Amino acid sequence: PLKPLVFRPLKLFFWATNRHVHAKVVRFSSPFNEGVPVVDISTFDAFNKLKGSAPVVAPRSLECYKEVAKMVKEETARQNINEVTLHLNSHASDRGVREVVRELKNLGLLVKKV
């Protein structure tokens, strides 16, 4: 019962590793050509930012997950992006990824699964 594939110009991707969570926004013109990444934010950037001001425990923490969502919201708002579609895979069910997605929805970004 796999559903047919639907092409979308803007998609959100997550890459969950042992140490960090990476979020990217990529624009596509056709499935046969490479995309162009417009946003590239990971918990590594948030950790370097918060640690200077507010001590955090480690990159994989609730404080950094919310910080990553906030930074993603600013970049999309500046570029006039308000709606994205999430790419679902094994990493999409990670607890860290789910926290970031919840924060993005509350901030105002409309994320669609289908």
Binding site: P4, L5, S90
Partner: protein, 142 residues
């Protein structure tokens, strides 16, 4: 003693680069050996049909768990994936019917012409009869 079940023609109907129109059947299969790609659909018996005007494509994908997945795609005419392609497809559908009627000839009638009018229900044409037949517009109020 003997006997045989009616044959089911499993298999592909089109190859790579062949043009299709909406509603055309591409694959008849008993199990989901092939999966739907872009611009296609799937029936409850794993029949794959086209949903736009374009050309058929085949591709293979390797999944996370090491399995092999096979897709069927329909590519637009000029690789146009913009949302404006839908209206172009609608015009092509109308044009195709006109081409077919011209080739067939006038004596292959495509509409009925009875000595009576078919009833109207819910704003559409219905093939079911009413209890009484009457001429349209031949009566006045009261």
């Amino acid at each position: 003693q003997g006997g045989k079940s009616h044959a089911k023609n499993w298999g592909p109907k089109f190859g790579d680069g062949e043009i299709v129109f909406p509603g055309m059947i591409i694959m008849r299969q008993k199990q989901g050996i092939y999966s739907p790609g872009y611009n296609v659909g799937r029936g409850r018996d794993y029949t794959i049909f086209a949903k736009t005007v374009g050309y058929v494509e085949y591709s293979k994908l390797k999944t996370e768990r090491g399995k092999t997945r096979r897709y069927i795609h329909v590519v637009p005419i000029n690789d146009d994936w913009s949302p404006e392609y839908q209206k172009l497809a609608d015009e092509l559908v109308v044009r195709r019917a006109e081409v077919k009627r011209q080739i067939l000839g006038h004596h292959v009638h495509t509409e009925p012409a009875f000595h009576f009018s078919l009833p109207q229900r819910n704003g559409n044409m219905s093939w079911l009869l009413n209890s009484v037949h009457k001429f349209p517009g031949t009566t006045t109020l009261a």
